[PDB]
Write a protein that binds this ligand. Structure first.
Ligand SMILES: C[C@H](OP(=O)(O)OP(=O)(O)OP(=O)(O)OC[C@H]1O[C@@H](n2cnc3c(N)ncnc32)[C@H](O)[C@@H]1O)c1ccccc1[N+](=O)[O-]
Length: 248
Protein backbone atom coordinates (compact mmCIF):
# COMPACT_ATOMS: atom_id res chain seq x y z
CA UNK A 1 0.00 0.00 0.00
CA UNK A 2 1.01 3.59 -0.58
CA UNK A 3 0.01 6.90 0.94
CA UNK A 4 -2.93 8.67 -0.63
CA UNK A 5 -0.34 11.30 -1.51
CA UNK A 6 1.69 8.69 -3.40
CA UNK A 7 -1.43 7.50 -5.25
CA UNK A 8 -2.51 10.93 -6.48
CA UNK A 9 1.06 11.56 -7.56
CA UNK A 10 1.08 8.36 -9.58
CA UNK A 11 -2.04 9.68 -11.37
CA UNK A 12 -0.59 13.06 -12.36
CA UNK A 13 -1.57 15.29 -9.41
CA UNK A 14 0.43 17.01 -6.66
CA UNK A 15 -1.68 17.56 -3.51
CA UNK A 16 -0.46 20.73 -1.78
CA UNK A 17 -2.74 20.12 1.23
CA UNK A 18 -4.49 17.02 2.58
CA UNK A 19 -7.59 19.07 3.42
CA UNK A 20 -8.69 19.25 -0.22
CA UNK A 21 -10.13 15.71 -0.18
CA UNK A 22 -13.14 16.63 1.97
CA UNK A 23 -13.52 20.04 0.31
CA UNK A 24 -14.17 18.66 -3.18
CA UNK A 25 -17.17 16.52 -2.19
CA UNK A 26 -19.05 19.77 -1.60
CA UNK A 27 -18.16 21.41 -4.94
CA UNK A 28 -21.12 22.44 -7.10
CA UNK A 29 -19.42 24.77 -9.65
CA UNK A 30 -16.57 24.38 -12.17
CA UNK A 31 -14.86 27.51 -13.54
CA UNK A 32 -12.38 27.52 -16.43
CA UNK A 33 -9.95 30.33 -17.08
CA UNK A 34 -9.82 30.04 -20.88
CA UNK A 35 -6.16 30.64 -21.82
CA UNK A 36 -3.80 27.78 -20.93
CA UNK A 37 -6.53 25.37 -19.82
CA UNK A 38 -9.01 25.00 -22.69
CA UNK A 39 -6.16 26.16 -24.99
CA UNK A 40 -2.44 25.42 -25.18
CA UNK A 41 -1.97 29.12 -24.47
CA UNK A 42 0.23 29.42 -27.59
CA UNK A 43 -0.41 32.37 -29.97
CA UNK A 44 -0.22 31.94 -33.78
CA UNK A 45 -0.49 34.39 -36.69
CA UNK A 46 -3.69 33.73 -38.69
CA UNK A 47 -3.50 36.69 -41.12
CA UNK A 48 -1.02 39.41 -42.19
CA UNK A 49 -2.00 42.39 -44.32
CA UNK A 50 0.81 44.42 -45.92
CA UNK A 51 3.86 43.83 -48.14
CA UNK A 52 7.17 42.01 -47.53
CA UNK A 53 9.13 45.14 -46.51
CA UNK A 54 6.68 46.01 -43.74
CA UNK A 55 6.76 42.42 -42.61
CA UNK A 56 10.61 42.51 -42.42
CA UNK A 57 10.53 45.80 -40.46
CA UNK A 58 8.08 44.59 -37.84
CA UNK A 59 9.83 41.22 -37.48
CA UNK A 60 13.26 42.81 -36.99
CA UNK A 61 11.98 44.80 -33.99
CA UNK A 62 10.02 41.97 -32.37
CA UNK A 63 13.09 39.73 -32.45
CA UNK A 64 14.57 41.57 -29.43
CA UNK A 65 11.54 40.72 -27.24
CA UNK A 66 10.52 37.63 -25.32
CA UNK A 67 6.82 38.35 -25.33
CA UNK A 68 4.79 35.42 -26.71
CA UNK A 69 3.42 37.86 -29.35
CA UNK A 70 6.92 38.78 -30.47
CA UNK A 71 7.96 35.14 -30.86
CA UNK A 72 4.89 34.25 -32.98
CA UNK A 73 5.43 37.20 -35.37
CA UNK A 74 9.14 36.41 -35.78
CA UNK A 75 8.25 32.72 -36.34
CA UNK A 76 5.68 33.50 -39.03
CA UNK A 77 7.98 35.99 -40.76
CA UNK A 78 10.87 33.57 -41.21
CA UNK A 79 8.45 31.01 -42.61
CA UNK A 80 7.69 33.61 -45.31
CA UNK A 81 11.39 34.01 -46.13
CA UNK A 82 12.18 37.21 -44.22
CA UNK A 83 15.76 38.10 -43.28
CA UNK A 84 16.20 39.84 -39.93
CA UNK A 85 17.62 43.38 -40.04
CA UNK A 86 19.69 45.39 -37.55
CA UNK A 87 17.77 47.59 -35.11
CA UNK A 88 18.66 50.53 -32.80
CA UNK A 89 17.07 52.46 -29.93
CA UNK A 90 14.91 49.45 -29.14
CA UNK A 91 12.23 49.89 -26.48
CA UNK A 92 9.54 47.60 -25.17
CA UNK A 93 7.02 49.69 -23.32
CA UNK A 94 5.65 46.94 -21.11
CA UNK A 95 1.90 46.42 -21.42
CA UNK A 96 1.49 48.16 -24.78
CA UNK A 97 3.97 47.31 -27.54
CA UNK A 98 7.49 47.68 -28.81
CA UNK A 99 9.66 50.05 -30.85
CA UNK A 100 12.92 50.66 -32.70
CA UNK A 101 14.68 52.43 -35.58
CA UNK A 102 15.79 51.20 -39.02
CA UNK A 103 17.19 53.06 -42.03
CA UNK A 104 16.18 56.32 -40.32
CA UNK A 105 12.55 55.13 -40.05
CA UNK A 106 10.73 54.78 -36.75
CA UNK A 107 8.79 51.51 -36.34
CA UNK A 108 6.15 50.74 -33.72
CA UNK A 109 4.16 47.51 -33.25
CA UNK A 110 1.10 47.45 -30.91
CA UNK A 111 -2.60 46.72 -30.22
CA UNK A 112 -4.97 47.66 -33.07
CA UNK A 113 -8.48 49.03 -32.61
CA UNK A 114 -11.36 47.76 -34.81
CA UNK A 115 -11.27 44.26 -36.40
CA UNK A 116 -7.52 43.52 -36.22
CA UNK A 117 -5.36 42.58 -33.23
CA UNK A 118 -1.93 44.11 -33.99
CA UNK A 119 -0.75 47.17 -35.98
CA UNK A 120 2.48 48.39 -37.61
CA UNK A 121 3.37 52.10 -37.76
CA UNK A 122 6.11 53.71 -39.85
CA UNK A 123 6.87 57.31 -38.86
CA UNK A 124 3.37 57.63 -37.38
CA UNK A 125 1.48 56.14 -40.38
CA UNK A 126 -0.41 52.83 -39.99
CA UNK A 127 0.75 50.56 -42.85
CA UNK A 128 0.12 46.87 -41.97
CA UNK A 129 -1.70 44.57 -39.48
CA UNK A 130 -1.85 41.05 -38.03
CA UNK A 131 -4.53 38.78 -36.62
CA UNK A 132 -3.35 36.45 -33.86
CA UNK A 133 -4.99 33.36 -32.30
CA UNK A 134 -4.57 30.59 -29.69
CA UNK A 135 -5.02 26.83 -30.32
CA UNK A 136 -7.78 24.78 -28.57
CA UNK A 137 -6.63 21.57 -26.83
CA UNK A 138 -7.04 18.33 -28.81
CA UNK A 139 -9.59 16.36 -26.79
CA UNK A 140 -12.71 18.18 -25.57
CA UNK A 141 -15.04 17.64 -22.64
CA UNK A 142 -17.49 14.89 -22.00
CA UNK A 143 -18.61 18.09 -20.32
CA UNK A 144 -21.97 16.37 -20.28
CA UNK A 145 -20.23 13.85 -18.04
CA UNK A 146 -19.10 16.89 -16.05
CA UNK A 147 -22.78 17.84 -16.03
CA UNK A 148 -23.44 14.20 -15.16
CA UNK A 149 -20.65 13.71 -12.59
CA UNK A 150 -23.15 15.70 -10.60
CA UNK A 151 -25.45 18.60 -11.41
CA UNK A 152 -22.29 20.65 -11.90
CA UNK A 153 -22.60 24.26 -13.08
CA UNK A 154 -19.94 25.08 -15.71
CA UNK A 155 -18.60 28.56 -16.49
CA UNK A 156 -15.98 30.13 -18.77
CA UNK A 157 -13.98 33.25 -17.94
CA UNK A 158 -11.99 35.07 -20.65
CA UNK A 159 -10.22 38.34 -21.42
CA UNK A 160 -10.84 37.98 -25.17
CA UNK A 161 -13.63 39.51 -27.27
CA UNK A 162 -17.24 38.32 -27.35
CA UNK A 163 -17.13 36.41 -30.65
CA UNK A 164 -13.91 34.48 -29.87
CA UNK A 165 -15.34 33.27 -26.52
CA UNK A 166 -18.81 32.61 -27.93
CA UNK A 167 -17.33 30.59 -30.80
CA UNK A 168 -15.34 28.32 -28.47
CA UNK A 169 -18.30 28.18 -26.05
CA UNK A 170 -20.90 27.12 -28.64
CA UNK A 171 -18.24 24.76 -29.99
CA UNK A 172 -18.40 22.83 -26.72
CA UNK A 173 -22.00 23.08 -25.44
CA UNK A 174 -21.45 25.62 -22.65
CA UNK A 175 -24.08 28.34 -22.36
CA UNK A 176 -22.54 30.38 -19.52
CA UNK A 177 -19.44 32.46 -20.25
CA UNK A 178 -18.21 36.01 -19.58
CA UNK A 179 -15.95 37.80 -22.09
CA UNK A 180 -13.64 40.84 -21.93
CA UNK A 181 -12.76 40.52 -18.25
CA UNK A 182 -9.91 42.20 -16.39
CA UNK A 183 -8.13 40.24 -13.63
CA UNK A 184 -10.09 42.27 -11.07
CA UNK A 185 -13.41 41.47 -12.78
CA UNK A 186 -12.82 37.74 -12.32
CA UNK A 187 -12.26 38.32 -8.59
CA UNK A 188 -15.60 40.19 -8.40
CA UNK A 189 -17.44 37.30 -10.09
CA UNK A 190 -15.96 34.69 -7.79
CA UNK A 191 -16.89 36.78 -4.72
CA UNK A 192 -20.53 37.11 -5.81
CA UNK A 193 -20.79 33.41 -6.58
CA UNK A 194 -19.52 32.39 -3.17
CA UNK A 195 -21.61 35.07 -1.45
CA UNK A 196 -24.79 33.37 -2.65
CA UNK A 197 -24.54 29.66 -2.12
CA UNK A 198 -22.07 28.18 -4.58
CA UNK A 199 -19.01 26.06 -3.79
CA UNK A 200 -16.39 26.83 -6.41
CA UNK A 201 -13.64 24.76 -7.99
CA UNK A 202 -11.44 26.82 -10.36
CA UNK A 203 -8.71 25.83 -12.84
CA UNK A 204 -6.21 28.45 -14.12
CA UNK A 205 -2.47 28.85 -14.77
CA UNK A 206 0.01 31.41 -13.37
CA UNK A 207 -0.94 34.80 -14.80
CA UNK A 208 -4.04 36.98 -14.54
CA UNK A 209 -5.61 34.43 -12.25
CA UNK A 210 -3.37 34.18 -9.19
CA UNK A 211 -5.79 36.37 -7.19
CA UNK A 212 -8.92 34.60 -8.49
CA UNK A 213 -7.48 31.20 -7.68
CA UNK A 214 -6.67 32.23 -4.05
CA UNK A 215 -10.33 33.02 -3.47
CA UNK A 216 -11.84 29.75 -4.78
CA UNK A 217 -12.90 26.88 -2.51
CA UNK A 218 -10.65 24.43 -4.38
CA UNK A 219 -7.93 25.71 -6.71
CA UNK A 220 -6.27 23.78 -9.57
CA UNK A 221 -3.09 25.02 -11.33
CA UNK A 222 -1.43 23.69 -14.54
CA UNK A 223 2.09 22.22 -14.27
CA UNK A 224 3.31 24.82 -16.76
CA UNK A 225 7.92 25.25 -9.34
CA UNK A 226 6.60 27.17 -6.33
CA UNK A 227 2.97 27.13 -7.53
CA UNK A 228 2.05 29.20 -4.46
CA UNK A 229 -1.75 29.34 -4.35
CA UNK A 230 -3.25 26.10 -5.70
CA UNK A 231 -4.56 23.21 -3.64
CA UNK A 232 -3.71 20.91 -6.56
CA UNK A 233 -1.05 21.00 -9.28
CA UNK A 234 -1.75 19.12 -12.48
CA UNK A 235 1.75 17.94 -13.44
CA UNK A 236 0.03 15.71 -15.94
CA UNK A 237 -0.84 18.93 -17.81
CA UNK A 238 -3.73 16.81 -19.08
CA UNK A 239 -7.25 17.96 -18.24
CA UNK A 240 -8.54 14.39 -18.44
CA UNK A 241 -7.01 13.53 -15.07
CA UNK A 242 -9.04 15.93 -12.94
CA UNK A 243 -12.00 15.25 -15.19
CA UNK A 244 -11.56 11.78 -13.70
CA UNK A 245 -10.93 13.26 -10.27
CA UNK A 246 -14.33 15.00 -10.25
CA UNK A 247 -16.03 11.58 -10.15
CA UNK A 248 -15.33 9.97 -6.78
C1 LIG B 1 -0.09 37.21 -24.81
C2 LIG B 1 -1.23 36.86 -25.76
O1 LIG B 1 -2.41 37.67 -25.56
P1 LIG B 1 -2.78 38.41 -24.16
O2 LIG B 1 -2.69 37.41 -23.03
O3 LIG B 1 -4.08 39.17 -24.36
O4 LIG B 1 -1.59 39.49 -24.00
P2 LIG B 1 -0.88 39.81 -22.58
O5 LIG B 1 0.16 38.74 -22.31
O6 LIG B 1 -1.94 40.12 -21.55
O7 LIG B 1 -0.07 41.13 -22.97
P3 LIG B 1 -0.25 42.49 -22.15
O8 LIG B 1 -1.66 42.55 -21.60
O9 LIG B 1 0.94 42.65 -21.23
O10 LIG B 1 -0.10 43.53 -23.37
C3 LIG B 1 -1.16 44.44 -23.69
C4 LIG B 1 -1.38 44.46 -25.20
O11 LIG B 1 -0.33 45.18 -25.86
C5 LIG B 1 0.02 44.52 -27.09
N1 LIG B 1 1.42 44.07 -27.00
C6 LIG B 1 2.08 43.76 -25.87
N2 LIG B 1 3.36 43.40 -26.12
C7 LIG B 1 3.54 43.48 -27.46
C8 LIG B 1 4.65 43.23 -28.40
N3 LIG B 1 5.88 42.82 -27.97
N4 LIG B 1 4.40 43.43 -29.72
C9 LIG B 1 3.20 43.84 -30.18
N5 LIG B 1 2.15 44.08 -29.38
C10 LIG B 1 2.26 43.92 -28.03
C11 LIG B 1 -0.89 43.32 -27.22
O12 LIG B 1 -1.95 43.65 -28.13
C12 LIG B 1 -1.43 43.08 -25.83
O13 LIG B 1 -2.76 42.54 -25.88
C13 LIG B 1 -1.51 35.40 -25.64
C14 LIG B 1 -0.85 34.69 -24.64
C15 LIG B 1 -1.07 33.33 -24.49
C16 LIG B 1 -1.92 32.65 -25.35
C17 LIG B 1 -2.59 33.30 -26.37
C18 LIG B 1 -2.42 34.66 -26.56
N6 LIG B 1 -3.10 35.29 -27.61
O14 LIG B 1 -3.33 36.49 -27.58
O15 LIG B 1 -3.47 34.62 -28.56
Amino acid sequence: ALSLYEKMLHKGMIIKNSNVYEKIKEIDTIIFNKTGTLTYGTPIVTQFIGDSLSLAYAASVEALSSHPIAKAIVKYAKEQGVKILEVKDFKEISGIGVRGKISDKIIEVKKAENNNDIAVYINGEPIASFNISDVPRPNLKDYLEKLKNEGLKIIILSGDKEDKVKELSKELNIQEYYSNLSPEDKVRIIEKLKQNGNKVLMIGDGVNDAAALALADVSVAMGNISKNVADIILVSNDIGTLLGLIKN
